[PDB]
Design a protein around this ligand. Structure first.
Ligand SMILES: NC(=O)c1ccc[n+]([C@@H]2O[C@H](COP(=O)([O-])OP(=O)(O)OC[C@H]3O[C@@H](n4cnc5c(N)ncnc54)[C@H](O)[C@@H]3O)[C@@H](O)[C@H]2O)c1
Length: 204
């Protein structure tokens, strides 16, 4: 099966805007999404710390998480699509925070082989929501790890760019507790990034 890869910003925005018009999100769902784009690192950080258990969160955050989850009843991709994400070294583990990058800006090759040993051809579960973009965008394309996600037709995925608090991000949000399988890992041509290819699964 082939996956749609946008290569033009205006073409991506036109497609995304068309999807967003059909969702019919409620007022409260939209509020939850806007706030998510302002506070995602904090929300996702708490979901990771507590392994997806929200019982101990403040009541307003439980409500927001519930509305974000509910929004995906309305938000599905109509086709196989490729999505993009930038991550910093901690994404790979605590052990990579201060070892992944060399002084000259290149990925350390020993750290890269350890990352492959740890993640290649294996499932990974993410407790947070996964923010992605329809293309490589400048806000995140300079991070040391770039992931290309293969997301199948009918999967939960929502273009929230129209109500994001930030410009230029072409954001497609994926649900929390998603599992993906890392199919490939390689160094970029200039040796400054790791490129990950992964197939998105469900939230089971
Ligand atoms: N990064 C992107 O590709 C991207 C794409 C579109 C929009 N956004 C926007 O950026 C903001 C969210 O940023 P984010 O995506 O970095 O937030 P995040 O919560 O996913 O990640 C925060 C930080 O933790 C790291 N991280 C992610 N998963 C981790 C894990 N399992 N263990 C340890 N560290 C982990 C990330 O690399 C990042 O440095 C929001 O405003 C969102 O709208 C980001």
């Amino acid at each position: 099966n082939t996956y749609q890869e946008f290569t033009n910003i205006d073409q991506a925005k036109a497609w995304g805007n068309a999807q967003y018009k059909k969702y019919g999100l409620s007022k409260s769902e939209k509020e939850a999404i806007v706030s998510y784009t302002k506070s995602a690192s904090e929300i996702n950080g708490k979901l990771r710390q507590n392994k997806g258990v929200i019982n101990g969160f403040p009541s307003n955050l439980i409500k927001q998480v519930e509305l974000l989850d509910k929004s995906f009843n309305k938000m599905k991709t109509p086709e196989n699509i490729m999505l993009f994400r930038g991550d910093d070294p901690a994404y790979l583990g605590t052990e990579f925070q201060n070892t992944l990058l060399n002084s000259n800006g290149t990925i350390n090759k020993t750290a890269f082989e350890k990352a492959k040993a740890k993640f290649l051809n294996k499932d990974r579960l993410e407790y947070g929501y996964i923010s992605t973009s329809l293309m490589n965008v400048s806000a995140f394309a300079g991070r040391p790890i770039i992931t290309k996600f293969k997301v199948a037709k009918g999967s939960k995925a929502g273009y929230i760019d129209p109500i994001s608090a930030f410009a230029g991000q072409l954001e497609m949000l994926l649900p929390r507790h998603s599992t993906y399988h890392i199919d490939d890992m390689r160094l970029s041509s200039d040796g400054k990034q790791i490129i990950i290819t992964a197939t998105m699964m469900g939230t089971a």
